[PDB]
Every structure is written in structure tokens, then in C-alpha cells.
């Protein structure tokens, strides 16, 4: 379990989760505040 | 060390001694192999159990009285989507600050056993809970049933945790049932009692 957590903390997994979260965020923001060219 | 198991004929995991209330050697994924994780999972199972018991009572007791002439409260599944004296979001904010306070002090308790036993306003009042997950004091244990012999504590906490499991499963059951059938849980109970041969889950899926 500790080993599995360590694996989940490895660079590619961390990157997939981080950029996944970011992608989700930017997507939702661009869904609620769409076509933003100013601000 | 010597206790009935979830899977007779199997060896319980090393981290499950049996000194914990509700220990039946069930952790086939080893989600509680680490001591801290096991401990946090114990607290989480506690709060889940109690919230789910309150919930199960909260949907099954009124729905059963609603079916009689005693009450006329609407379905538990649609009790949220209705309007009240104020908007539901205001209620949700008040809930967030109040429950936020309670859960805050409880979190501080989990991360540091002693630090949250005294009342910040009136230092006279204190909590008499010895181990975490069981606050005690006058507010949470006015009958003093929380402090006793280790045997009675084991028994009572085992009852608590078991009724908790049953409650969790019951609430999940209520949710899925109202999703499928489209009526109240009591209606389902009576339908099943009326015809257990056909009026089941396959009465809609097949």
C-alpha cells in the first residue's frame, strides 16, 4: 500500500493527475465563462 | 487473536489483531495495512456509520409513518428539491459554518488527541473522552454510558459499528431503489412481501 502510494507519487502519474485536474478546471471555466478575449 | 471471521478458513491480516471493535479480518485489499491509514479509516468508518444510521432512521422511520395516517411528509428522495422559508443555499452555508466548526474541532482531535477537550469560552466545561472517536463529556455522553469496562466498551462499540454497516448498506439501498423502482422504500418492502417470487429487481430489468 505504501509502495502503491509511492508509485502514485511517481513523475508520470503525478503529471497525469495534475494535468488532468488542470484540464478539467480550464474546461469548466471555459464552459461557464466562454469566448473570453478580455480578462 | 481468536475471533469469528468474514471468511471462515482464512488467515486474518497481520494488522488486524482483533483488539478493534468490529474486527472480522476483512481487508482483502489491505487498505488498512499502514497503522495511520488504519486509524484514519477507523475514524472515517465511525462517522460514516453514525451519519448513515441517522440517515437510515431519517428516511425509513418517516416513510413508514407516512404510509400510515401518522405523518404526511414527502419522499426522502425529493425532500431536497423543494423550497423552504429561505433558499436551500443559505441553509447550506449555515450548515457549512456550523458543521465546519464541529468537524474542525474533531479534525484537530484526530490529528492531536488532547488539544480540543476544553471549552474556549468557559474553561470549566471539559470532555471526558479517553480515546479518539468517542468524545464523551456532558454534551456527547450525558448518561455516562461512554465510560465503562473494556469488555462493555468492546461490545457497545461493536454494536455501534455493526448497526453502522447495516445503515450504510441501507441508505445506499434506498438511493439505488428509488432510482430503479421510482417509489418509496416502504412501497418496495410491501411489494416484495406481497410477491417475493417476482416483485424483485428482475421485475424491471428483465
Amino acid at each position: 500500500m505504501r509502495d502503491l502510494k509511492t508509485y502514485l507519487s511517481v513523475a508520470p502519474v503525478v503529471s497525469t493527475l495534475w494535468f488532468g485536474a488542470l484540464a478539467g478546471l480550464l474546461i469548466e471555466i471555459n464552459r461557464f465563462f466562454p469566448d473570453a478575449l478580455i480578462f | 487473536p481468536d475471533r469469528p471471521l468474514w471468511f471462515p478458513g482464512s488467515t486474518p491480516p497481520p494488522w488486524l489483531d482483533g483488539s478493534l471493535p468490529g474486527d472480522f479480518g476483512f481487508d482483502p485489499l489491505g487498505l488498512g495495512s499502514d497503522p495511520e491509514s488504519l486509524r484514519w479509516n477507523v475514524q472515517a468508518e465511525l462517522v460514516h456509520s453514525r451519519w448513515a444510521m441517522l440517515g437510515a432512521a431519517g428516511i425509513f422511520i418517516p416513510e413508514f409513518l407516512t404510509k400510515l395516517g401518522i405523518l404526511n411528509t414527502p419522499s426522502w428522495y425529493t425532500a431536497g428539491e423543494q423550497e423552504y422559508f429561505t433558499d436551500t443555499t443559505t441553509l447550506f452555508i449555515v450548515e457549512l459554518v456550523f458543521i465546519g466548526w464541529a468537524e474542525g474541532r474533531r479534525w484537530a482531535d484526530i490529528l492531536n488527541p488532547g488539544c480540543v477537550n476544553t471549552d474556549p469560552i468557559f474553561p470549566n466545561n471539559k470532555l471526558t473522552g479517553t480515546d479518539v472517536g468517542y468524545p464523551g463529556g456532558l454534551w456527547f455522553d450525558p448518561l455516562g454510558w461512554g465510560s465503562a469496562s473494556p469488555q462493555k466498551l468492546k461490545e457497545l462499540r461493536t454494536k455501534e459499528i455493526k448497526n453502522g454497516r447495516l445503515a450504510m448498506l441501507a441508505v445506499m439501498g434506498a438511493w439505488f431503489q428509488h432510482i430503479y423502482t421510482g417509489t418509496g422504500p416502504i412501497d418496495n418492502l410491501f411489494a416484495h412481501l406481497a410477491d417475493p417470487g417476482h416483485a424483485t429487481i428482475f421485475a424491471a430489468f428483465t
Binding site: - | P4, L5, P8, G9, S10, G197, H198, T200, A203
Partner: protein, 218 residues
């Protein structure tokens, strides 16, 4: 001992120790060399025993309603062929007290305990006697032999008290099991080619052996 389609490989590990040992293994499935998973001598023996017992039950169960219905001891509504009972819905259904899938869930529920425990006696023979079970664990202690548990529950009539009788009864059990398994296979293919029950096939064969035959019905 008499041999039945044996070979050097076969006779090298089949020594007449198991009941029904005619040295028959032209593929070598029971070869003790490189064993693992489910290809293992002991497990294959146990499996033969289980498939044999169940096929003994089924070979009778598949023919009894058709027979008793052709006689008249049971009503014609329950005088259905084995494949018309609802086991294969597009071939026939019958309305029982419960739904077929519900009945299936019930079936898996009971068989779940009955089988999981039986396996637990194979993995750990000493178990199924320690854990509480309505006081039934006393008669579920096994006997050191997984396939042959005995006790008050599985052998109340105290059969096989002596060795020369026990081995003889094991032999008879294995033979009856193999015959019953071939009987089930026969039910499957005969039903798959004729379209009628196996007892009807028997009657049609007894009536006219020459005309009613496998070479005839395609």
C-alpha cells in the same frame, strides 16, 4: 489390474491407487510432472468425483419428469422435457413460484455457501469446524480426504465401515459417475439432433431400431 487404452506415460503415474484406475490418460493430464493451477492429479481426481456425482443426479433428473409423465404419476404440465423446463427459454418456459432469474439468484445463494465451504475443506481440511455455524461445524469437520468427508451429515448410514468395502464402493461410485456423465453428454447431443426428449428417443428406438437411428435423423 485390467488396463483400458493405456500407455507407458499413463502407466508411469497411474498405479491403480485411485478408484477406477484403468490406466486411461492418452493425453497425460494427470502427469505429476510440471503441475500447477488446475492441471494437478489430486484436483483432477476430485473434479472427476464432483462432475460424476452431479451428473449422476442430473442424468436421473433430466429423464424422470419425461418418464413419470409418460406413465401418469405426475400431471402433464410438469411432464416437460429437460430443456423445456425453462433452462433454455427459447426452447420452452414454465411458470414456477418465482422468476427464473430470481430462482437463479436463490440457487447461487445456497450453492454459494455449500460450495465455498467445501472448497475451504480442500484448501484447509481442518477448517469448517472451528468457526461457528449454528453448531453445524461439528459435522462439517471433514475426514482428511477432501472428496470423501463423511460424518453425521454426509454419511449418517455409516457405510464403508471397513477397507475392502470402502474401496469397492468408491470404485462403484466412480463407474456410475462416468456412465452418468456420458449419459448427460448423450442427452445434450441427442436433444440437439432429434428435437425431442431422450426417453422419446428411447421409445422410438425400441419401436423401430432400424428406422429410428442416428444415421437416419440428421
Amino acid at each position: 489390474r485390467p488396463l483400458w487404452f493405456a500407455s507407458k506415460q499413463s502407466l508411469s503415474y497411474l498405479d491403480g491407487s485411485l478408484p477406477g484406475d484403468y490406466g486411461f490418460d492418452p493425453l497425460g493430464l494427470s502427469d505429476p510432472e510440471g503441475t500447477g493451477g488446475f492441471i494437478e492429479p489430486r484436483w483432477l481426481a476430485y473434479g472427476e468425483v464432483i462432475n460424476g456425482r452431479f451428473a449422476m443426479l442430473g442424468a436421473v433428473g433430466a429423464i424422470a419428469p419425461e418418464y413419470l409423465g409418460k406413465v401418469g404419476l405426475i400431471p402433464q404440465e410438469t411432464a416437460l422435457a429437460w430443456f423445456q423446463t425453462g433452462v433454455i427459454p427459447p426452447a420452452g418456459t414454465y411458470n414456477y413460484w418465482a422468476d427464473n432469474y430470481t430462482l437463479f439468484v436463490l440457487e447461487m445463494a445456497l450453492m454459494g455457501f455449500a460450495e465455498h465451504r467445501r472448497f475451504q475443506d480442500w484448501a484447509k481440511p481442518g477448517s469448517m469446524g472451528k468457526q461457528y455455524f449454528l453448531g453445524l461445524e461439528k459435522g462439517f469437520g471433514g475426514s482428511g480426504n477432501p472428496a470423501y468427508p463423511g460424518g453425521p451429515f454426509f454419511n449418517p448410514l455409516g457405510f464403508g465401515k471397513d477397507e475392502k468395502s470402502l474401496k469397492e464402493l468408491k470404485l462403484k461410485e466412480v463407474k456410475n459417475g462416468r456412465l452418468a456423465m456420458l449419459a448427460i453428454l448423450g442427452y445434450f447431443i441427442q436433444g440437439l439432433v432429434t428435437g425431442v426428449g431422450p426417453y422419446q428417443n428411447l421409445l422410438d428406438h425400441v419401436a423401430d431400431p432400424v428406422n429410428n437411428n442416428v444415421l437416419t435423423s440428421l
